[PDB]
Design a protein around this ligand. Structure first.
Ligand SMILES: Nc1ncnc2c1ncn2[C@@H]1O[C@H](COP(=O)(O)OP(=O)(O)OP(O)(O)=S)[C@@H](O)[C@H]1O
Ligand SMILES: Nc1ncnc2c1ncn2[C@@H]1O[C@H](COP(=O)(O)OP(=O)(O)OP(O)(O)=S)[C@@H](O)[C@H]1O
Ligand SMILES: [Mg+2]
Ligand SMILES: [Mg+2]
Lengths: 419, 187, 419
């Protein structure tokens, strides 16, 4: 049977199924071991079993296959991948493998791969003919990615303010600069909801780095697209592994003319993990961060691009400021001029319960004329001109009480030009 | 069949609001009983306060939904009753209001609006003149039963529970708390 | 065949060459490795293959030859250059070499060099008798480098304003001071277009440091002269390596009585890379900069000169201010009195969307008498006199409309003197 439907199956149903199969006590161990025991029993039954997941290359071709639901954890049920199929299928990290899987025999403890019937949701030779990601030429984002849901939700103020604040397109590279307790998590949640609502075609990925378990478990039960998260319990090695896996999977998906969106919470946490995992380069900058340590995160954040031939990769990574540590400020200043989209959140607006707390005058996007049409561009320019003199709290309260009294942003434009 | 579906949806909203009132009263009386009890039960008292607050919000939402449904039923009854009456007496309406009603298919937009406003306040004046003598009127014969069952106006218990207004943040947090409560109670 | 022509071909021809030569599994890897494999396969047949590129020498004579198409990236397609050849020819970094190449034998994987055909676009023994760049006596700029295309275009107006703001000469060390989001990139576009149109003889080079990939690729498809850039993904070592490669190539070109023009964006980020790459000297200045950290950028900027023996080297490098980082500011005052012509952009003019946003009052050139005729010098002097008292925003809107009504600069002068 399928491995994913077993993994998504709740623990109580898993132990009930194991009791039906015959195992006396398969409840007092981890879920990975339970699923491994189920696989043992059903392989002893002798029936064919499906398998799928994301492929990973080790330092010597000792290939592994993880799953996104388990946050790419190195569990005993991870599917072994011999170098042989790596060689005659030309597979790298991030490939989505699916097909038959061999039950392991004496001498090995990992389920081998019998044969593949799909890679990257496509026929294997088509995957062979695909072009490698970094050979594709990037451009500026052309396709507008609208955030307004249009359902007239009472909470939809965040998406409307986002649309009027910073144009988000199919290929942007975005930063969300915010102090603690400003609404980053729910802003990302609203963005994910808008992506899953207005644009069901594009693949949506949400990556959480060393986040609190309660926020994580709220996240998998709120978004529609698959979400991967890491907690602060495990060390920085797993954070680096998960980030690398996510970026490679996104590159593989976008190599097939697909649209990928990655939400990062947060880029500062990943930068710190990279800083504390890499060996010292011999020279350290201010704040106790290695100069080479920031090389790896940039390659992540720099992966966002708009390809001519097909597909795009959008990355919205939030950054933390005013935390109280100098290395956070160093990380923020190294990323100050990197992304082409930036959104600034103000603590003063957040503490006055005027949400979403966004610093309008300090938030904007690059090449906004390419993303949207003209008349909308002059409408937004007039809006920026009129609300520029007023303060950030006053500007946000004015936008809130003007937007709440109607349903569509077009109506707001009509009333502001009419009045 | 629009009138019938509006009617039984209004009845369902009435039943739901009555039920929610039942659980609200039960929770309030049980919390009061525990408060009168000797046992401290601080956590029990706090979660009972949460219970009564969430159920009060639910009762307010149900009352508002029922009020809107009843208003919609009354509006559609007005629409179709007026429709059949005007289909009966449109020639008389035209005879009474000719000096400013024809030419609508060719008059300018401002002229059309001014003409319809003049017709509207003329009709308002006529309605006031007829209501001056204060003759009693009954419901329409075709749909009397439904309107009598739903009543002339929503109950006072429906209106007195809608005075309080909730901000969208309050609405969303109350909805989340109610969903969590339903999930916990189901398990 | 020629290595350069196949390197300039897009990835579309990659599949055609692979299927022609029987190597189907050749698309899913680095393009440089693909070129190396194709060249190996073609040389195995015994045909004759040319080669060319820019030479560089390591610390132990392990000479390599890079190509400007790949932005001087160290790859498998780099051409071997043995110490014997650089001793018999006495060549250093920046030399342009063209001639025979050799397929590597067992023990090495780098294509070798049989003999040279052309050195710096000259016969090798003629370029042999050349006097060194540092032995050239600098002079002031003499030959005016006009930026007016004269075709009466729409964007040409910007260039026209340039010709009224700061005269640019041949062999002039220039500085562009601009806040973020001020239009420096399009200013560089206009300058490059003017160089490619008015003066096709002089060599034009556009150097970009740690720029986002979209701007890098947009630069490559708009300028006619060769352009080199390194994305911010690459480490500071890449940035410096590109900097010395470009400056040595420019010095070698100007040693042959050629006019070289370099456009640098930005000198601030190049100084940042130099700061974060050099070892600490134990003496740190305010802002995290080291005493010798800015030494090498100073040499790079001061390499620009006007040589009386022959040739010229012009450098126009932009510097970032008001970024929010004190280290960028420190780099700014360390370069404030260095360049002999400077041009300030202002944020407030860009806020009103009047373009180009140039602070005319504070911008100018020193010793501009040698760069222009006298009558138009007094014309510009009286223009400065009549424009100085009024504000910069009013000055720019006035200049824009007055130049818009006219068609050439002389028309502007005559219409302003008739009144
Ligand atoms: N639109 C909103 N509606 C209701 N409450 C909001 C809104 N925006 C923010 N809040 C409140 O403000 C706080 C924001 O919480 P979070 O989004 O978790 O903060 P954060 O940005 O994730 O920073 P951390 O992770 O807590 S350090 C919570 O107490 C929310 O209830
Ligand atoms: N002459 C012009 N006509 C029309 N739009 C212009 C003109 N000059 C600048 N702009 C616009 O002004 C903005 C400036 O863009 P850029 O030149 O890319 O900014 P920048 O100076 O490179 O600074 P960065 O790279 O964003 S930090 C863009 O939106 C341009 O379209
Ligand atoms: Mg959070
Ligand atoms: Mg730029």
């Amino acid at each position: 049977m399928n491995l994913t439907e077993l993994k998504n199956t709740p623990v109580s149903e898993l132990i009930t199924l194991g009791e039906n199969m015959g195992l006396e006590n398969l409840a007092r161990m981890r879920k990975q071991d339970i699923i491994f025991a189920i696989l043992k029993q059903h392989a002893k039954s002798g029936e064919d079993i499906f398998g799928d997941g994301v492929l990973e290359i080790l330092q010597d071709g000792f290939g592994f296959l993880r799953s996104a639901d388990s946050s790419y954890l190195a569990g005993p049920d991870d599917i072994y991948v011999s170098p042989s199929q790596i060689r005659r299928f030309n597979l790298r990290t991030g490939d989505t493998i699916s097909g038959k899987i061999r039950p392991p025999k004496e001498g090995e403890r990992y389920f081998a791969l019998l044969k593949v019937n799909e890679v990257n949701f496509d026929k294997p030779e088509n995957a062979r003919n695909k072009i490698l990601f970094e050979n594709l030429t990037p451009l500026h984002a052309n396709s507008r990615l609208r955030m307004e849901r249009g359902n007239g939700s009472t909470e939809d103020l965040t998406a409307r303010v986002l649309d009027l604040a910073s144009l988000i397109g199919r290929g942007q590279r975005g930063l969300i600069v915010a102090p603690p307790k400003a609404g980053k998590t729910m802003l990302l949640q609203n963005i994910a909801q808008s992506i899953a609502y207005n644009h069901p075609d594009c693949v949506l990925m949400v990556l959480l780095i060393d986040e609190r378990p309660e926020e994580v478990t709220e996240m998998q039960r709120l978004v529609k697209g698959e979400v991967v998260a890491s907690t602060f319990d495990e060390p920085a090695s797993r954070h680096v592994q998960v980030a690398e896996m996510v970026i490679e999977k996104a590159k593989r998906l976008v190599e097939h003319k697909k649209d990928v969106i990655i939400l990062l919470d947060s880029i500062t946490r990943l930068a710190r993990a990279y800083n504390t995992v890499v060996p010292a380069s011999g020279k350290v900058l201010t704040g106790g961060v290695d100069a080479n340590a920031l090389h790896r995160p940039k390659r992540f954040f720099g992966a966002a691009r708009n390809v001519e031939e097909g597909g795009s990769l959008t990355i919205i990574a939030t950054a933390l400021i005013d935390t109280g540590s100098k290395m956070d400020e160093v990380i923020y200043e190294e990323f100050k001029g990197t992304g082409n989209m930036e959104l600034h959140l103000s603590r003063k607006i957040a503490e006055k319960r005027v949400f979403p707390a966004i610093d309008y005058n300090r938030s904007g996007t690059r090449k906004e004329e390419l993303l949207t049409t003209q008349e909308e561009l002059q409408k937004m320019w007039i809006l920026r001109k009129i609300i520029h003199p007023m303060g950030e709290i006053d500007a946000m309260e004015f936008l809130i009480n003007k937007l709440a009294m109607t349903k569509t942003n077009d109506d707001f434009f009509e009333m502001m030009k009419r009045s | 069949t629009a009138l019938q579906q509006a009617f039984d949806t209004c009845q369902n909203n009435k039943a739901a609001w009555l039920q929610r009132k039942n659980e609200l009263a039960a929770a309030e009386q049980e919390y009061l009983r525990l408060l009168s009890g000797e046992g401290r039960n601080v956590s029990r008292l706090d979660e009972l306060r949460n219970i009564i607050e969430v159920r009060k919000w639910q009762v307010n939402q149900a009352a508002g939904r029922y009020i809107r449904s009843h208003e919609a039923v009354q509006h559609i009854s007005i629409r179709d009753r007026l429709n059949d009456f005007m289909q009966q007496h449109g020639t008389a309406l035209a005879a009474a209001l000719a000096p400013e009603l024809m030419g609508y298919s060719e008059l300018t937009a401002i002229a059309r609006n001014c003409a319809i406003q003049r017709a509207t306040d003329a009709l308002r004046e006529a309605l006031l003149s007829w209501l001056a003598k204060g003759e009693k009127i009954n419901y329409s014969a075709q749909d009397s039963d439904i309107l009598t069952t739903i009543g002339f106006r929503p109950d006072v218990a429906s209106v007195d529970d809608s005075r309080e207004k909730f901000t969208p943040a309050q609405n969303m947090i109350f909805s989340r708390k109610s969903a969590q409560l339903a999930s916990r109670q189901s398990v």
